[PDB]
Design an enzyme around this catalytic site. Structure first.
Site, PDB file in Angstrom:
ATOM      1  N   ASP A 205      45.242  82.387  43.536  1.00 44.29           N
ATOM      2  CA  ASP A 205      44.996  81.182  42.750  1.00 44.29           C
ATOM      3  C   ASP A 205      44.342  80.134  43.662  1.00 44.29           C
ATOM      4  OD1 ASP A 205      45.126  78.753  41.308  1.00 44.29           O
ATOM      5  OD2 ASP A 205      46.989  79.325  40.319  1.00 44.29           O
ATOM      6  N   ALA A 206      43.014  80.058  43.599  1.00 41.96           N
ATOM      7  CA  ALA A 206      42.232  79.139  44.432  1.00 41.96           C
ATOM      8  C   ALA A 206      42.058  77.809  43.713  1.00 41.96           C
ATOM      9  CB  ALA A 206      40.876  79.749  44.754  1.00 41.96           C
TER      10      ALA A 206
ATOM     11  N   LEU B 282      45.174  73.641  47.155  1.00 39.06           N
ATOM     12  CA  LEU B 282      45.719  74.789  47.882  1.00 39.06           C
ATOM     13  C   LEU B 282      45.217  76.099  47.301  1.00 39.06           C
ATOM     14  CD1 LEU B 282      49.425  73.719  48.423  1.00 39.06           C
ATOM     15  CD2 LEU B 282      47.566  73.650  50.096  1.00 39.06           C
ATOM     16  N   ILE B 283      45.033  77.078  48.179  1.00 38.94           N
ATOM     17  CA  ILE B 283      44.825  78.443  47.758  1.00 38.94           C
ATOM     18  C   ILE B 283      46.140  79.179  47.948  1.00 38.94           C
ATOM     19  CG2 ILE B 283      43.573  80.590  48.104  1.00 38.94           C
ATOM     20  CD1 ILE B 283      41.471  78.660  49.607  1.00 38.94           C
TER      21      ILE B 283
ATOM     22  N   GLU C 253      43.002  80.373  34.709  1.00 41.72           N
ATOM     23  CA  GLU C 253      44.274  79.973  35.322  1.00 41.72           C
ATOM     24  C   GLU C 253      45.411  79.691  34.326  1.00 41.72           C
ATOM     25  OE1 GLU C 253      44.635  75.959  37.063  1.00 41.72           O
ATOM     26  OE2 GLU C 253      42.476  75.750  36.699  1.00 41.72           O
TER      27      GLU C 253
ATOM     28  N   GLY D  90      49.693  65.747  42.034  1.00 42.74           N
ATOM     29  CA  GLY D  90      49.677  65.847  43.491  1.00 42.74           C
ATOM     30  C   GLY D  90      48.511  65.157  44.170  1.00 42.74           C
TER      31      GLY D  90
ATOM     32  N   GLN E  81      48.464  62.030  46.965  1.00 43.53           N
ATOM     33  CA  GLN E  81      47.784  62.038  48.248  1.00 43.53           C
ATOM     34  C   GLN E  81      46.778  60.883  48.374  1.00 43.53           C
ATOM     35  OE1 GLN E  81      47.300  66.094  50.311  1.00 43.53           O
ATOM     36  NE2 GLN E  81      46.666  66.490  48.194  1.00 43.53           N
TER      37      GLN E  81
ATOM     38  N   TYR F 188      50.017  65.381  54.570  1.00 44.17           N
ATOM     39  CA  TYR F 188      50.902  65.555  53.418  1.00 44.17           C
ATOM     40  C   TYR F 188      52.376  65.470  53.796  1.00 44.17           C
ATOM     41  CZ  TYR F 188      53.077  67.471  49.246  1.00 44.17           C
ATOM     42  OH  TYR F 188      53.843  67.635  48.125  1.00 44.17           O
TER      43      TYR F 188
ATOM     44  N   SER G 219      52.583  73.025  43.210  1.00 44.37           N
ATOM     45  CA  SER G 219      52.964  72.798  44.595  1.00 44.37           C
ATOM     46  C   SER G 219      53.246  71.329  44.892  1.00 44.37           C
ATOM     47  CB  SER G 219      51.868  73.291  45.539  1.00 44.37           C
ATOM     48  OG  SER G 219      51.437  74.597  45.216  1.00 44.37           O
TER      49      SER G 219
HETATM   50  C1  SH3 Z   1      41.604  70.843  35.537  1.00 51.01           C
HETATM   51  C2  SH3 Z   1      42.928  71.501  35.963  1.00 51.01           C
HETATM   52  C3  SH3 Z   1      43.299  72.614  34.969  1.00 51.01           C
HETATM   53  C4  SH3 Z   1      42.722  72.107  37.368  1.00 51.01           C
HETATM   54  O1  SH3 Z   1      43.870  72.854  37.786  1.00 51.01           O
HETATM   55  P1  SH3 Z   1      44.617  72.533  39.172  1.00 51.01           P
HETATM   56  O2  SH3 Z   1      43.733  72.502  40.358  1.00 51.01           O
HETATM   57  O3  SH3 Z   1      45.778  73.666  39.278  1.00 51.01           O
HETATM   58  O4  SH3 Z   1      45.418  71.132  39.008  1.00 51.01           O
HETATM   59  C5  SH3 Z   1      44.085  70.462  36.047  1.00 51.01           C
HETATM   60  O5  SH3 Z   1      43.860  69.580  37.144  1.00 51.01           O
HETATM   61  C6  SH3 Z   1      44.244  69.590  34.783  1.00 51.01           C
HETATM   62  O6  SH3 Z   1      44.704  70.039  33.736  1.00 51.01           O
HETATM   63  N1  SH3 Z   1      43.858  68.325  34.946  1.00 51.01           N
HETATM   64  C7  SH3 Z   1      43.939  67.307  33.888  1.00 51.01           C
HETATM   65  C8  SH3 Z   1      42.767  67.440  32.912  1.00 51.01           C
HETATM   66  C9  SH3 Z   1      43.113  66.667  31.635  1.00 51.01           C
HETATM   67  O7  SH3 Z   1      43.779  67.211  30.761  1.00 51.01           O
HETATM   68  N2  SH3 Z   1      42.689  65.392  31.585  1.00 51.01           N
HETATM   69  C10 SH3 Z   1      42.971  64.498  30.453  1.00 51.01           C
HETATM   70  C11 SH3 Z   1      43.250  63.130  31.064  1.00 51.01           C
HETATM   71  C12 SH3 Z   1      42.132  62.311  30.803  1.00 51.01           C
HETATM   72  C13 SH3 Z   1      42.196  61.203  29.962  1.00 51.01           C
HETATM   73  C14 SH3 Z   1      41.039  60.441  29.765  1.00 51.01           C
HETATM   74  C15 SH3 Z   1      39.883  60.767  30.361  1.00 51.01           C
HETATM   75  C16 SH3 Z   1      39.831  61.818  31.165  1.00 51.01           C
HETATM   76  C17 SH3 Z   1      40.904  62.578  31.402  1.00 51.01           C
HETATM   77  O8  SH3 Z   1      38.582  61.947  31.659  1.00 51.01           O
HETATM   78  C18 SH3 Z   1      38.013  60.663  31.555  1.00 51.01           C
HETATM   79  O9  SH3 Z   1      38.643  60.191  30.311  1.00 51.01           O
HETATM   80  N1  ADP Z   2      50.191  71.830  52.571  1.00 46.74           N
HETATM   81  C1  ADP Z   2      49.763  70.926  51.668  1.00 46.74           C
HETATM   82  N2  ADP Z   2      48.681  70.144  51.877  1.00 46.74           N
HETATM   83  C2  ADP Z   2      48.275  69.246  50.954  1.00 46.74           C
HETATM   84  N3  ADP Z   2      48.916  69.055  49.779  1.00 46.74           N
HETATM   85  C3  ADP Z   2      50.021  69.782  49.441  1.00 46.74           C
HETATM   86  C4  ADP Z   2      50.508  70.772  50.409  1.00 46.74           C
HETATM   87  N4  ADP Z   2      51.594  71.348  49.889  1.00 46.74           N
HETATM   88  C5  ADP Z   2      51.800  70.778  48.679  1.00 46.74           C
HETATM   89  N5  ADP Z   2      50.867  69.844  48.403  1.00 46.74           N
HETATM   90  C6  ADP Z   2      50.871  69.049  47.137  1.00 46.74           C
HETATM   91  O1  ADP Z   2      50.623  69.908  46.023  1.00 46.74           O
HETATM   92  C7  ADP Z   2      49.389  69.548  45.406  1.00 46.74           C
HETATM   93  C8  ADP Z   2      48.613  70.797  45.103  1.00 46.74           C
HETATM   94  O2  ADP Z   2      49.334  71.470  44.085  1.00 46.74           O
HETATM   95  P1  ADP Z   2      48.779  72.858  43.556  1.00 46.74           P
HETATM   96  O3  ADP Z   2      49.644  73.280  42.401  1.00 46.74           O
HETATM   97  O4  ADP Z   2      48.631  73.804  44.728  1.00 46.74           O
HETATM   98  O5  ADP Z   2      47.339  72.348  43.047  1.00 46.74           O
HETATM   99  P2  ADP Z   2      45.975  73.215  43.025  1.00 46.74           P
HETATM  100  O6  ADP Z   2      46.231  74.425  42.151  1.00 46.74           O
HETATM  101  O7  ADP Z   2      45.050  72.205  42.406  1.00 46.74           O
HETATM  102  O8  ADP Z   2      45.664  73.508  44.476  1.00 46.74           O
HETATM  103  C9  ADP Z   2      48.657  68.624  46.359  1.00 46.74           C
HETATM  104  O9  ADP Z   2      47.793  67.728  45.657  1.00 46.74           O
HETATM  105  C10 ADP Z   2      49.802  67.951  47.083  1.00 46.74           C
HETATM  106  O10 ADP Z   2      50.298  66.815  46.374  1.00 46.74           O
HETATM  107 MG    MG Z   3      46.567  75.178  40.240  1.00 43.77          MG
END
Ligand code: SH3
Ligand code: ADP
Ligand code: MG
Ligand code: SH3
Ligand code: ADP
Ligand code: MG
Lengths: 265, 265
Positions: free
Chosen positions: B6-7, B11-12, B70, B121, B125, B137, B224
């Protein structure tokens, strides 16, 4: 001379009613002593109070007044303003963005509070100060209007790069999520980011309960919108983007004050 | 061996299955090329990829990979971990608190995305950085655990000597007390607790809301963002319990998508 007062956490909204002509006045809640002073230089038929600081006015004043619950007053006063300004809504969500944010579903007959969140004008000011050291509200909001959020906020497209994402690429993915990528931030940009997160959360929660209670109409009131077009813009555009109909109301911030007068009889 | 990845935006997550043993690994998404060079050395029977940055992996490696969305991967992994850890849930919301936050309703047979918000998260940060200048972090989270939100957040009781229409102890407005306590210099710990505070309150609010809408008392929290953050977990856990819902945290919940991509075929 009938007077409705919504004494909230940040602002005291004063509506005077005389000969079907209403005048609007606003004071800072910090200056509640000057409102009491002012009230006793006045001849007032009925005094109608609502909001958190209604007790403070009630106890420190000699003349009789009556307290009403702010959720009912807001809902009753809002309904009145909507009808005067030509909006015929069988139902709607309304979001009251004051110091905090209170969400209600009006079914056409009464209101019920269906949610709330601490992201409002209190946070705009509060977190705005921490990031800019500005205390003056006009100064803070004006400055924010020039702001760019690109280097601060993270979008879906920034996560998904060239792969087509499962939800619109343009959406905010994480507020303040681009900060750690742009470490090489002006008060304009930062203040716009604070207003942005407050906006997006309110709209999110509003749209969610709007869907839950099966109506497409969402009304936004509160002084948090005054002198802050960006906030108004952030809220309306996302409401529309989700297929709901946003409504703004002139003197919408005085809904509680007007509703108090109406609840009185 | 078998490899699920899960990239994500920050985090990956890498799940290695070998000799009936699971290894859970985290690498920073800034070190993706490093992860790519590691994948090219390895003897891999099956590579399964998901997440925004899955495409950057696929185009840079020298073996075939199966890519999945995802949301579907997160759901499949979570349902596996849940059953493995003794939980027999007929239905639930799952709240994915990653870089941003994604909310999902599992009906028994499948998941649907029911909302999201950019408070997660990545806000912790970036906003944390602006208020403290801490980019590490671990330093950021450690610091925040002893934080006190009292002098920073505004509760309902502070707005209302009157009895409020909703419980007084609730947060009325995050950072809403700042203007009242100007004289105090706000410690980094206290500021960071309030950042984590507002992020936790917004996500938990939205998850409770969708839980009510879809008529489930179960909310499963993953992502995370909870790692090294007892405060966040606590904020989320206490308010979920506060609103009459059952909160679930899952061992290896942050690796749900990585696991699920191996079993989506
Ligand atoms: C996009 C993603 C699936 C990415 O996955 P991950 O890296 O695991 O956090 C996840 O970050 C996510 O669901 N983010 C929130 C996307 C969302 O539902 N936004 C609605 C909030 C919002 C409200 C108003 C907005 C707006 C966004 O864009 C500008 O106007
Ligand atoms: N080692 C780390 N470095 C940076 N952030 C971390 C770390 N471990 C946990 N986090 C927290 O978890 C968040 C990432 O959550 P995660 O579910 O892995 O998101 P994504 O799927 O977007 O990578 C970060 O934004 C931070 O708040
Ligand atoms: Mg994620
Ligand atoms: C309290 C009040 C009605 C006062 O009106 P006003 O002075 O006009 O802002 C309004 O500010 C409001 O509704 N604020 C939000 C209160 C609320 O619903 N909070 C839920 C958000 C929350 C979520 C999680 C929480 C929490 C609070 O307390 C600890 O855990
Ligand atoms: N002149 C002003 N002074 C201070 N805050 C203002 C002013 N005008 C607008 N605001 C905004 O309105 C918010 C308060 O909105 P309001 O609906 O009056 O809430 P309350 O009922 O809690 O006073 C403030 O936190 C701020 O964001
Ligand atoms: Mg108010």
């Amino acid at each position: 001379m009938k007077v409705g007062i919504d004494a909230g956490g940040t602002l005291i909204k004063i509506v005077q009613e005389q000969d079907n002509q209403r005048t609007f006045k606003t004071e800072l809640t910090k200056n509640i002593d000057q409102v009491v002073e002012w009230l006793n230089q006045q001849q007032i038929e009925k005094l109608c109070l609502t909001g958190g600081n209604a007790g403070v006015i009630a106890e420190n004043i000699n003349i009789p007044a009556q307290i009403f619950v702010e959720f009912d007053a807001a809902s009753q006063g809002l309904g009145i303003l909507l009808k005067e300004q030509g909006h015929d809504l069988a139902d709607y969500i309304f979001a009251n963005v004051g110091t905090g944010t209170s969400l209600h579903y009006f079914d056409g007959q009464s209101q019920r509070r269906v949610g709330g969140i601490g992201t409002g004008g209190g946070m705009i000011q509060g977190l705005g100060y921490l990031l800019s050291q500005i205390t003056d509200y006009k100064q803070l909001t004006d400055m924010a209007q020039h702001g760019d959020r690109n280097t601060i906020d993270l979008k879906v497209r920034h996560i998904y790069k060239d792969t087509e994402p499962p939800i619109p690429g343009d959406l905010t993915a994480a507020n303040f999520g681009h900060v750690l990528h742009h470490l090489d931030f002006t008060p304009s940009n930062k203040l716009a980011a604070v207003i942005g997160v407050v906006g997006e959360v309110v709209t999110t929660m509003a749209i969610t309960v709007a869907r839950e209670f099966k109506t497409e109409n969402i009304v936004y009131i509160g002084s948090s919108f005054h002198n802050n077009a960006l906030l108004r813009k952030v809220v309306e555009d996302y409401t529309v983007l989700r297929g709901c109909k946003p409504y703004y109301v002139e003197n919408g911030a005085f809904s509680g004050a007007i509703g108090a007068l109406y609840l009185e009889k």
